[PDB]
């Protein structure tokens, strides 16, 4: 147990991926490549298993910062997931993934209200889930 290489012990979500990166790519380049990867990329969160095409990464917020449930209920991202969905993050050190969801509030593409996702709980799908018609 003295000096050993850990087999990437992290999620499988974007944070899991975006992390794999911080191990390779630098800071600037990194954010670019990864953001992209997560971009147009659907991710099923472990919240309750929901797929969201992350198309934006709000490198401002984090699973610890507070947001108002897209509608106005202000909860620190972590709470939203861990306390309302039972997804204990603890890895609130990464940004957010404001995803383009299919929660169409009205048919006709142009998508609905985004999904400020947790890199740590958004299991990488690779589905792309084209979605909408915009």
mmCIF file of N, CA and C in Angstrom:
data_model
loop_
_atom_site.group_PDB
_atom_site.id
_atom_site.type_symbol
_atom_site.label_atom_id
_atom_site.label_comp_id
_atom_site.label_asym_id
_atom_site.label_seq_id
_atom_site.Cartn_x
_atom_site.Cartn_y
_atom_site.Cartn_z
ATOM 1 N N UNK A 1 0.843 -1.225 0.000
ATOM 2 C CA UNK A 1 0.000 0.000 0.000
ATOM 3 C C UNK A 1 0.864 1.256 0.000
ATOM 4 N N UNK A 2 2.140 1.092 -0.338
ATOM 5 C CA UNK A 2 3.072 2.214 -0.378
ATOM 6 C C UNK A 2 3.343 2.653 -1.813
ATOM 7 N N UNK A 3 2.922 3.873 -2.141
ATOM 8 C CA UNK A 3 3.114 4.422 -3.482
ATOM 9 C C UNK A 3 2.493 3.513 -4.539
ATOM 10 N N UNK A 4 1.246 3.801 -4.898
ATOM 11 C CA UNK A 4 0.536 3.011 -5.896
ATOM 12 C C UNK A 4 -0.295 3.883 -6.822
ATOM 13 N N UNK A 5 -0.416 3.435 -8.067
ATOM 14 C CA UNK A 5 -1.181 4.159 -9.060
ATOM 15 C C UNK A 5 -2.656 3.779 -8.995
ATOM 16 N N UNK A 6 -3.502 4.766 -8.720
ATOM 17 C CA UNK A 6 -4.939 4.538 -8.619
ATOM 18 C C UNK A 6 -5.597 4.510 -9.993
ATOM 19 N N UNK A 7 -6.321 3.430 -10.272
ATOM 20 C CA UNK A 7 -7.015 3.277 -11.544
ATOM 21 C C UNK A 7 -8.163 4.276 -11.644
ATOM 22 N N UNK A 8 -7.835 5.508 -12.049
ATOM 23 C CA UNK A 8 -8.809 6.589 -12.179
ATOM 24 C C UNK A 8 -10.072 6.329 -11.354
ATOM 25 N N UNK A 9 -9.964 6.556 -10.049
ATOM 26 C CA UNK A 9 -11.081 6.346 -9.142
ATOM 27 C C UNK A 9 -11.977 7.577 -9.074
ATOM 28 N N UNK A 10 -12.857 7.703 -10.061
ATOM 29 C CA UNK A 10 -13.781 8.804 -10.140
ATOM 30 C C UNK A 10 -15.043 8.308 -10.808
ATOM 31 N N UNK A 11 -15.986 9.194 -11.002
ATOM 32 C CA UNK A 11 -17.238 8.833 -11.630
ATOM 33 C C UNK A 11 -17.046 8.332 -13.049
ATOM 34 N N UNK A 12 -18.118 8.450 -13.803
ATOM 35 C CA UNK A 12 -18.152 8.090 -15.202
ATOM 36 C C UNK A 12 -18.889 9.197 -15.916
ATOM 37 N N UNK A 13 -19.255 10.181 -15.102
ATOM 38 C CA UNK A 13 -19.946 11.369 -15.545
ATOM 39 C C UNK A 13 -18.966 12.285 -16.239
ATOM 40 N N UNK A 14 -19.387 13.493 -16.575
ATOM 41 C CA UNK A 14 -18.464 14.397 -17.220
ATOM 42 C C UNK A 14 -17.333 14.702 -16.256
ATOM 43 N N UNK A 15 -17.634 15.171 -15.044
ATOM 44 C CA UNK A 15 -16.594 15.437 -14.060
ATOM 45 C C UNK A 15 -15.585 14.305 -14.093
ATOM 46 N N UNK A 16 -16.076 13.084 -14.314
ATOM 47 C CA UNK A 16 -15.192 11.935 -14.399
ATOM 48 C C UNK A 16 -14.291 12.121 -15.612
ATOM 49 N N UNK A 17 -14.914 12.484 -16.736
ATOM 50 C CA UNK A 17 -14.184 12.736 -17.967
ATOM 51 C C UNK A 17 -13.326 14.005 -17.827
ATOM 52 N N UNK A 18 -13.985 15.166 -17.641
ATOM 53 C CA UNK A 18 -13.287 16.437 -17.473
ATOM 54 C C UNK A 18 -12.075 16.257 -16.532
ATOM 55 N N UNK A 19 -12.177 15.319 -15.579
ATOM 56 C CA UNK A 19 -11.069 15.050 -14.648
ATOM 57 C C UNK A 19 -9.929 14.364 -15.380
ATOM 58 N N UNK A 20 -10.269 13.251 -16.032
ATOM 59 C CA UNK A 20 -9.317 12.480 -16.823
ATOM 60 C C UNK A 20 -8.397 13.425 -17.566
ATOM 61 N N UNK A 21 -8.979 14.556 -17.908
ATOM 62 C CA UNK A 21 -8.315 15.615 -18.633
ATOM 63 C C UNK A 21 -7.319 16.392 -17.800
ATOM 64 N N UNK A 22 -7.760 16.889 -16.649
ATOM 65 C CA UNK A 22 -6.869 17.658 -15.796
ATOM 66 C C UNK A 22 -5.611 16.856 -15.487
ATOM 67 N N UNK A 23 -5.671 15.557 -15.760
ATOM 68 C CA UNK A 23 -4.522 14.683 -15.563
ATOM 69 C C UNK A 23 -3.584 14.786 -16.770
ATOM 70 N N UNK A 24 -4.170 15.062 -17.939
ATOM 71 C CA UNK A 24 -3.415 15.206 -19.189
ATOM 72 C C UNK A 24 -3.260 16.670 -19.597
ATOM 73 N N UNK A 25 -4.271 17.170 -20.303
ATOM 74 C CA UNK A 25 -4.284 18.536 -20.809
ATOM 75 C C UNK A 25 -4.060 19.566 -19.704
ATOM 76 N N UNK A 26 -3.610 20.755 -20.101
ATOM 77 C CA UNK A 26 -3.357 21.842 -19.160
ATOM 78 C C UNK A 26 -4.668 22.408 -18.632
ATOM 79 N N UNK A 27 -4.675 23.702 -18.330
ATOM 80 C CA UNK A 27 -5.874 24.371 -17.847
ATOM 81 C C UNK A 27 -6.713 24.936 -18.998
ATOM 82 N N UNK A 28 -6.144 25.897 -19.728
ATOM 83 C CA UNK A 28 -6.844 26.543 -20.841
ATOM 84 C C UNK A 28 -7.293 25.538 -21.906
ATOM 85 N N UNK A 29 -6.335 24.848 -22.529
ATOM 86 C CA UNK A 29 -6.659 23.862 -23.557
ATOM 87 C C UNK A 29 -7.759 22.957 -23.048
ATOM 88 N N UNK A 30 -7.479 22.354 -21.906
ATOM 89 C CA UNK A 30 -8.394 21.457 -21.239
ATOM 90 C C UNK A 30 -9.834 21.945 -21.350
ATOM 91 N N UNK A 31 -10.188 22.956 -20.563
ATOM 92 C CA UNK A 31 -11.544 23.501 -20.559
ATOM 93 C C UNK A 31 -12.163 23.500 -21.946
ATOM 94 N N UNK A 32 -11.372 23.867 -22.935
ATOM 95 C CA UNK A 32 -11.842 23.899 -24.315
ATOM 96 C C UNK A 32 -12.293 22.517 -24.790
ATOM 97 N N UNK A 33 -11.349 21.582 -24.854
ATOM 98 C CA UNK A 33 -11.639 20.210 -25.292
ATOM 99 C C UNK A 33 -12.813 19.602 -24.545
ATOM 100 N N UNK A 34 -12.696 19.547 -23.231
ATOM 101 C CA UNK A 34 -13.739 18.962 -22.403
ATOM 102 C C UNK A 34 -15.076 19.647 -22.610
ATOM 103 N N UNK A 35 -15.146 20.956 -22.371
ATOM 104 C CA UNK A 35 -16.409 21.685 -22.544
ATOM 105 C C UNK A 35 -17.096 21.168 -23.786
ATOM 106 N N UNK A 36 -16.309 21.069 -24.837
ATOM 107 C CA UNK A 36 -16.767 20.571 -26.125
ATOM 108 C C UNK A 36 -17.364 19.186 -25.968
ATOM 109 N N UNK A 37 -16.560 18.282 -25.436
ATOM 110 C CA UNK A 37 -16.984 16.918 -25.228
ATOM 111 C C UNK A 37 -18.336 16.888 -24.547
ATOM 112 N N UNK A 38 -18.419 17.542 -23.398
ATOM 113 C CA UNK A 38 -19.673 17.618 -22.667
ATOM 114 C C UNK A 38 -20.734 18.314 -23.535
ATOM 115 N N UNK A 39 -20.296 19.206 -24.437
ATOM 116 C CA UNK A 39 -21.220 19.947 -25.311
ATOM 117 C C UNK A 39 -21.897 19.041 -26.342
ATOM 118 N N UNK A 40 -23.186 19.312 -26.594
ATOM 119 C CA UNK A 40 -23.962 18.510 -27.524
ATOM 120 C C UNK A 40 -24.015 17.061 -27.087
ATOM 121 N N UNK A 41 -23.496 16.812 -25.890
ATOM 122 C CA UNK A 41 -23.421 15.476 -25.325
ATOM 123 C C UNK A 41 -24.470 15.265 -24.240
ATOM 124 N N UNK A 42 -25.323 14.264 -24.402
ATOM 125 C CA UNK A 42 -26.330 13.979 -23.382
ATOM 126 C C UNK A 42 -25.684 13.279 -22.224
ATOM 127 N N UNK A 43 -26.162 13.579 -21.048
ATOM 128 C CA UNK A 43 -25.635 12.973 -19.875
ATOM 129 C C UNK A 43 -26.752 12.607 -18.939
ATOM 130 N N UNK A 44 -26.851 11.337 -18.607
ATOM 131 C CA UNK A 44 -27.883 10.949 -17.683
ATOM 132 C C UNK A 44 -27.331 11.091 -16.304
ATOM 133 N N UNK A 45 -27.978 11.936 -15.557
ATOM 134 C CA UNK A 45 -27.583 12.191 -14.205
ATOM 135 C C UNK A 45 -28.081 11.099 -13.303
ATOM 136 N N UNK A 46 -27.399 10.877 -12.198
ATOM 137 C CA UNK A 46 -27.811 9.818 -11.314
ATOM 138 C C UNK A 46 -28.935 10.306 -10.404
ATOM 139 N N UNK A 47 -29.277 11.604 -10.515
ATOM 140 C CA UNK A 47 -30.336 12.192 -9.696
ATOM 141 C C UNK A 47 -31.502 11.229 -9.625
ATOM 142 N N UNK A 48 -31.993 10.913 -10.804
ATOM 143 C CA UNK A 48 -33.095 10.006 -10.990
ATOM 144 C C UNK A 48 -32.988 9.425 -12.394
ATOM 145 N N UNK A 49 -31.750 9.435 -12.895
ATOM 146 C CA UNK A 49 -31.427 8.934 -14.225
ATOM 147 C C UNK A 49 -32.046 9.807 -15.306
ATOM 148 N N UNK A 50 -31.546 11.040 -15.456
ATOM 149 C CA UNK A 50 -32.087 11.927 -16.478
ATOM 150 C C UNK A 50 -31.020 12.391 -17.451
ATOM 151 N N UNK A 51 -31.300 12.197 -18.731
ATOM 152 C CA UNK A 51 -30.353 12.544 -19.786
ATOM 153 C C UNK A 51 -30.499 13.986 -20.224
ATOM 154 N N UNK A 52 -29.380 14.690 -20.221
ATOM 155 C CA UNK A 52 -29.356 16.089 -20.615
ATOM 156 C C UNK A 52 -28.209 16.390 -21.553
ATOM 157 N N UNK A 53 -28.524 16.915 -22.723
ATOM 158 C CA UNK A 53 -27.490 17.251 -23.672
ATOM 159 C C UNK A 53 -26.766 18.491 -23.188
ATOM 160 N N UNK A 54 -25.678 18.315 -22.454
ATOM 161 C CA UNK A 54 -24.927 19.462 -21.986
ATOM 162 C C UNK A 54 -24.383 20.179 -23.203
ATOM 163 N N UNK A 55 -24.771 21.439 -23.359
ATOM 164 C CA UNK A 55 -24.342 22.243 -24.494
ATOM 165 C C UNK A 55 -23.653 23.505 -24.006
ATOM 166 N N UNK A 56 -23.604 23.646 -22.690
ATOM 167 C CA UNK A 56 -22.976 24.781 -22.060
ATOM 168 C C UNK A 56 -22.372 24.372 -20.733
ATOM 169 N N UNK A 57 -21.214 24.914 -20.423
ATOM 170 C CA UNK A 57 -20.570 24.640 -19.157
ATOM 171 C C UNK A 57 -20.348 25.935 -18.421
ATOM 172 N N UNK A 58 -21.180 26.203 -17.437
ATOM 173 C CA UNK A 58 -21.030 27.419 -16.678
ATOM 174 C C UNK A 58 -19.883 27.253 -15.696
ATOM 175 N N UNK A 59 -18.675 27.548 -16.171
ATOM 176 C CA UNK A 59 -17.475 27.435 -15.354
ATOM 177 C C UNK A 59 -17.460 28.455 -14.219
ATOM 178 N N UNK A 60 -18.627 29.029 -13.938
ATOM 179 C CA UNK A 60 -18.787 29.971 -12.852
ATOM 180 C C UNK A 60 -19.375 29.237 -11.650
ATOM 181 N N UNK A 61 -20.581 28.697 -11.834
ATOM 182 C CA UNK A 61 -21.250 27.931 -10.798
ATOM 183 C C UNK A 61 -20.561 26.604 -10.555
ATOM 184 N N UNK A 62 -20.915 25.986 -9.444
ATOM 185 C CA UNK A 62 -20.398 24.682 -9.077
ATOM 186 C C UNK A 62 -21.460 23.986 -8.242
ATOM 187 N N UNK A 63 -21.395 22.657 -8.086
ATOM 188 C CA UNK A 63 -22.406 21.918 -7.329
ATOM 189 C C UNK A 63 -22.538 22.359 -5.877
ATOM 190 N N UNK A 64 -21.922 23.474 -5.528
ATOM 191 C CA UNK A 64 -22.003 23.996 -4.181
ATOM 192 C C UNK A 64 -22.694 25.356 -4.186
ATOM 193 N N UNK A 65 -22.550 26.071 -5.302
ATOM 194 C CA UNK A 65 -23.167 27.384 -5.464
ATOM 195 C C UNK A 65 -24.678 27.243 -5.496
ATOM 196 N N UNK A 66 -25.391 28.337 -5.266
ATOM 197 C CA UNK A 66 -26.846 28.293 -5.261
ATOM 198 C C UNK A 66 -27.449 28.761 -6.576
ATOM 199 N N UNK A 67 -28.558 28.127 -6.935
ATOM 200 C CA UNK A 67 -29.290 28.447 -8.151
ATOM 201 C C UNK A 67 -30.767 28.331 -7.866
ATOM 202 N N UNK A 68 -31.592 29.055 -8.592
ATOM 203 C CA UNK A 68 -33.013 28.967 -8.328
ATOM 204 C C UNK A 68 -33.690 28.051 -9.338
ATOM 205 N N UNK A 69 -33.812 26.778 -8.929
ATOM 206 C CA UNK A 69 -34.425 25.676 -9.697
ATOM 207 C C UNK A 69 -35.017 26.059 -11.042
ATOM 208 N N UNK A 70 -34.277 26.833 -11.832
ATOM 209 C CA UNK A 70 -34.745 27.250 -13.147
ATOM 210 C C UNK A 70 -36.019 28.095 -13.069
ATOM 211 N N UNK A 71 -36.796 27.905 -12.007
ATOM 212 C CA UNK A 71 -38.037 28.625 -11.827
ATOM 213 C C UNK A 71 -37.864 29.737 -10.812
ATOM 214 N N UNK A 72 -37.144 29.435 -9.741
ATOM 215 C CA UNK A 72 -36.909 30.437 -8.724
ATOM 216 C C UNK A 72 -36.593 29.891 -7.342
ATOM 217 N N UNK A 73 -36.785 28.598 -7.102
ATOM 218 C CA UNK A 73 -36.430 28.053 -5.801
ATOM 219 C C UNK A 73 -34.910 27.969 -5.735
ATOM 220 N N UNK A 74 -34.305 28.771 -4.865
ATOM 221 C CA UNK A 74 -32.860 28.843 -4.767
ATOM 222 C C UNK A 74 -32.260 27.793 -3.824
ATOM 223 N N UNK A 75 -31.558 26.823 -4.409
ATOM 224 C CA UNK A 75 -30.886 25.771 -3.659
ATOM 225 C C UNK A 75 -29.474 25.579 -4.175
ATOM 226 N N UNK A 76 -28.529 25.367 -3.269
ATOM 227 C CA UNK A 76 -27.174 25.104 -3.694
ATOM 228 C C UNK A 76 -27.211 23.821 -4.502
ATOM 229 N N UNK A 77 -26.739 23.886 -5.739
ATOM 230 C CA UNK A 77 -26.760 22.753 -6.644
ATOM 231 C C UNK A 77 -26.706 21.411 -5.926
ATOM 232 N N UNK A 78 -25.753 21.252 -5.021
ATOM 233 C CA UNK A 78 -25.612 20.006 -4.293
ATOM 234 C C UNK A 78 -26.942 19.572 -3.687
ATOM 235 N N UNK A 79 -27.591 20.487 -2.971
ATOM 236 C CA UNK A 79 -28.873 20.199 -2.337
ATOM 237 C C UNK A 79 -29.883 19.712 -3.357
ATOM 238 N N UNK A 80 -29.987 20.447 -4.450
ATOM 239 C CA UNK A 80 -30.893 20.101 -5.517
ATOM 240 C C UNK A 80 -30.822 18.609 -5.841
ATOM 241 N N UNK A 81 -29.613 18.127 -6.065
ATOM 242 C CA UNK A 81 -29.384 16.740 -6.439
ATOM 243 C C UNK A 81 -29.414 15.777 -5.252
ATOM 244 N N UNK A 82 -28.497 15.981 -4.317
ATOM 245 C CA UNK A 82 -28.382 15.134 -3.134
ATOM 246 C C UNK A 82 -29.635 15.117 -2.264
ATOM 247 N N UNK A 83 -30.201 16.281 -2.009
ATOM 248 C CA UNK A 83 -31.351 16.378 -1.127
ATOM 249 C C UNK A 83 -32.703 16.188 -1.823
ATOM 250 N N UNK A 84 -32.821 16.519 -3.112
ATOM 251 C CA UNK A 84 -34.101 16.345 -3.789
ATOM 252 C C UNK A 84 -34.117 15.097 -4.671
ATOM 253 N N UNK A 85 -32.939 14.581 -5.016
ATOM 254 C CA UNK A 85 -32.855 13.394 -5.856
ATOM 255 C C UNK A 85 -32.048 12.281 -5.201
ATOM 256 N N UNK A 86 -31.324 12.639 -4.144
ATOM 257 C CA UNK A 86 -30.501 11.698 -3.384
ATOM 258 C C UNK A 86 -29.140 11.447 -4.038
ATOM 259 N N UNK A 87 -28.597 12.441 -4.749
ATOM 260 C CA UNK A 87 -27.300 12.281 -5.370
ATOM 261 C C UNK A 87 -26.236 13.088 -4.647
ATOM 262 N N UNK A 88 -25.589 12.447 -3.689
ATOM 263 C CA UNK A 88 -24.532 13.090 -2.926
ATOM 264 C C UNK A 88 -23.322 13.309 -3.810
ATOM 265 N N UNK A 89 -23.098 14.565 -4.125
ATOM 266 C CA UNK A 89 -22.008 14.974 -4.989
ATOM 267 C C UNK A 89 -20.658 14.875 -4.312
ATOM 268 N N UNK A 90 -20.403 15.791 -3.385
ATOM 269 C CA UNK A 90 -19.145 15.825 -2.648
ATOM 270 C C UNK A 90 -17.993 16.240 -3.555
ATOM 271 N N UNK A 91 -18.269 16.252 -4.853
ATOM 272 C CA UNK A 91 -17.294 16.639 -5.855
ATOM 273 C C UNK A 91 -17.807 17.890 -6.528
ATOM 274 N N UNK A 92 -18.140 18.858 -5.689
ATOM 275 C CA UNK A 92 -18.692 20.115 -6.140
ATOM 276 C C UNK A 92 -17.594 21.066 -6.523
ATOM 277 N N UNK A 93 -16.478 20.497 -6.919
ATOM 278 C CA UNK A 93 -15.342 21.286 -7.296
ATOM 279 C C UNK A 93 -15.321 21.570 -8.790
ATOM 280 N N UNK A 94 -16.257 20.996 -9.558
ATOM 281 C CA UNK A 94 -16.279 21.264 -10.966
ATOM 282 C C UNK A 94 -17.392 22.247 -11.278
ATOM 283 N N UNK A 95 -17.436 22.789 -12.498
ATOM 284 C CA UNK A 95 -18.460 23.762 -12.863
ATOM 285 C C UNK A 95 -19.812 23.129 -13.079
ATOM 286 N N UNK A 96 -20.587 23.735 -13.955
ATOM 287 C CA UNK A 96 -21.904 23.239 -14.264
ATOM 288 C C UNK A 96 -22.026 22.967 -15.734
ATOM 289 N N UNK A 97 -23.022 22.193 -16.068
ATOM 290 C CA UNK A 97 -23.273 21.852 -17.446
ATOM 291 C C UNK A 97 -24.678 22.270 -17.800
ATOM 292 N N UNK A 98 -24.825 23.510 -18.230
ATOM 293 C CA UNK A 98 -26.124 24.004 -18.604
ATOM 294 C C UNK A 98 -26.467 23.337 -19.922
ATOM 295 N N UNK A 99 -27.268 22.295 -19.775
ATOM 296 C CA UNK A 99 -27.668 21.445 -20.870
ATOM 297 C C UNK A 99 -28.891 21.928 -21.614
ATOM 298 N N UNK A 100 -28.959 21.513 -22.864
ATOM 299 C CA UNK A 100 -30.090 21.775 -23.716
ATOM 300 C C UNK A 100 -31.019 20.563 -23.582
ATOM 301 N N UNK A 101 -32.091 20.668 -22.774
ATOM 302 C CA UNK A 101 -33.001 19.553 -22.523
ATOM 303 C C UNK A 101 -34.179 19.471 -23.482
ATOM 304 N N UNK A 102 -34.894 18.349 -23.414
ATOM 305 C CA UNK A 102 -36.052 18.114 -24.253
ATOM 306 C C UNK A 102 -37.348 18.343 -23.479
ATOM 307 N N UNK A 103 -37.279 19.154 -22.426
ATOM 308 C CA UNK A 103 -38.454 19.448 -21.617
ATOM 309 C C UNK A 103 -39.309 20.519 -22.296
ATOM 310 N N UNK A 104 -39.473 20.351 -23.608
ATOM 311 C CA UNK A 104 -40.230 21.274 -24.451
ATOM 312 C C UNK A 104 -41.462 21.832 -23.753
ATOM 313 N N UNK A 105 -41.410 23.118 -23.415
ATOM 314 C CA UNK A 105 -42.539 23.783 -22.786
ATOM 315 C C UNK A 105 -43.553 24.148 -23.862
ATOM 316 N N UNK A 106 -43.207 23.792 -25.097
ATOM 317 C CA UNK A 106 -44.054 24.061 -26.238
ATOM 318 C C UNK A 106 -43.430 23.555 -27.524
ATOM 319 N N UNK A 107 -44.108 22.621 -28.205
ATOM 320 C CA UNK A 107 -43.619 22.016 -29.450
ATOM 321 C C UNK A 107 -43.185 23.042 -30.491
ATOM 322 N N UNK A 108 -42.131 22.702 -31.228
ATOM 323 C CA UNK A 108 -41.606 23.592 -32.249
ATOM 324 C C UNK A 108 -40.132 23.882 -32.038
ATOM 325 N N UNK A 109 -39.380 22.849 -31.666
ATOM 326 C CA UNK A 109 -37.956 23.001 -31.417
ATOM 327 C C UNK A 109 -37.653 24.122 -30.452
ATOM 328 N N UNK A 110 -36.731 24.990 -30.862
ATOM 329 C CA UNK A 110 -36.285 26.151 -30.076
ATOM 330 C C UNK A 110 -36.087 25.821 -28.609
ATOM 331 N N UNK A 111 -36.019 24.537 -28.356
ATOM 332 C CA UNK A 111 -35.847 23.970 -27.021
ATOM 333 C C UNK A 111 -36.604 24.690 -25.900
ATOM 334 N N UNK A 112 -36.599 24.046 -24.724
ATOM 335 C CA UNK A 112 -37.170 24.558 -23.491
ATOM 336 C C UNK A 112 -36.103 25.141 -22.562
ATOM 337 N N UNK A 113 -36.373 25.084 -21.266
ATOM 338 C CA UNK A 113 -35.441 25.599 -20.266
ATOM 339 C C UNK A 113 -34.277 24.652 -19.989
ATOM 340 N N UNK A 114 -33.017 25.138 -20.103
ATOM 341 C CA UNK A 114 -31.793 24.348 -19.901
ATOM 342 C C UNK A 114 -31.754 23.477 -18.641
ATOM 343 N N UNK A 115 -30.626 22.769 -18.488
ATOM 344 C CA UNK A 115 -30.387 21.882 -17.350
ATOM 345 C C UNK A 115 -29.019 22.137 -16.730
ATOM 346 N N UNK A 116 -28.954 22.999 -15.716
ATOM 347 C CA UNK A 116 -27.681 23.252 -15.052
ATOM 348 C C UNK A 116 -27.310 21.969 -14.341
ATOM 349 N N UNK A 117 -26.470 21.203 -15.013
ATOM 350 C CA UNK A 117 -26.070 19.879 -14.569
ATOM 351 C C UNK A 117 -24.816 19.840 -13.702
ATOM 352 N N UNK A 118 -24.679 18.735 -12.967
ATOM 353 C CA UNK A 118 -23.503 18.500 -12.133
ATOM 354 C C UNK A 118 -22.555 17.550 -12.854
ATOM 355 N N UNK A 119 -21.365 18.029 -13.228
ATOM 356 C CA UNK A 119 -20.391 17.209 -13.936
ATOM 357 C C UNK A 119 -20.191 15.874 -13.236
ATOM 358 N N UNK A 120 -20.305 15.898 -11.911
ATOM 359 C CA UNK A 120 -20.081 14.714 -11.084
ATOM 360 C C UNK A 120 -21.189 13.665 -11.164
ATOM 361 N N UNK A 121 -22.419 14.078 -11.439
ATOM 362 C CA UNK A 121 -23.526 13.130 -11.476
ATOM 363 C C UNK A 121 -24.054 12.878 -12.892
ATOM 364 N N UNK A 122 -23.607 13.665 -13.873
ATOM 365 C CA UNK A 122 -24.066 13.495 -15.255
ATOM 366 C C UNK A 122 -23.277 12.415 -16.000
ATOM 367 N N UNK A 123 -23.668 11.157 -15.785
ATOM 368 C CA UNK A 123 -23.027 10.004 -16.425
ATOM 369 C C UNK A 123 -22.898 10.217 -17.932
ATOM 370 N N UNK A 124 -21.662 10.203 -18.432
ATOM 371 C CA UNK A 124 -21.409 10.370 -19.851
ATOM 372 C C UNK A 124 -22.176 9.315 -20.648
ATOM 373 N N UNK A 125 -23.037 9.763 -21.557
ATOM 374 C CA UNK A 125 -23.834 8.845 -22.371
ATOM 375 C C UNK A 125 -23.233 8.665 -23.754
ATOM 376 N N UNK A 126 -22.869 9.779 -24.376
ATOM 377 C CA UNK A 126 -22.326 9.727 -25.716
ATOM 378 C C UNK A 126 -23.442 9.563 -26.710
ATOM 379 N N UNK A 127 -24.638 9.688 -26.171
ATOM 380 C CA UNK A 127 -25.878 9.558 -26.912
ATOM 381 C C UNK A 127 -26.095 10.709 -27.871
ATOM 382 N N UNK A 128 -25.622 11.888 -27.482
ATOM 383 C CA UNK A 128 -25.762 13.092 -28.292
ATOM 384 C C UNK A 128 -27.205 13.580 -28.270
ATOM 385 N N UNK A 129 -28.120 12.620 -28.136
ATOM 386 C CA UNK A 129 -29.557 12.882 -28.125
ATOM 387 C C UNK A 129 -29.862 14.170 -28.865
ATOM 388 N N UNK A 130 -29.724 14.081 -30.182
ATOM 389 C CA UNK A 130 -29.960 15.180 -31.087
ATOM 390 C C UNK A 130 -31.080 16.063 -30.578
ATOM 391 N N UNK A 131 -32.217 15.447 -30.313
ATOM 392 C CA UNK A 131 -33.351 16.163 -29.720
ATOM 393 C C UNK A 131 -33.815 17.400 -30.510
ATOM 394 N N UNK A 132 -35.019 17.882 -30.153
ATOM 395 C CA UNK A 132 -35.628 19.070 -30.756
ATOM 396 C C UNK A 132 -35.480 19.103 -32.276
ATOM 397 N N UNK A 133 -35.789 20.251 -32.869
ATOM 398 C CA UNK A 133 -35.700 20.415 -34.316
ATOM 399 C C UNK A 133 -35.051 21.745 -34.685
ATOM 400 N N UNK A 134 -34.611 22.483 -33.674
ATOM 401 C CA UNK A 134 -33.972 23.776 -33.890
ATOM 402 C C UNK A 134 -32.666 23.619 -34.661
#
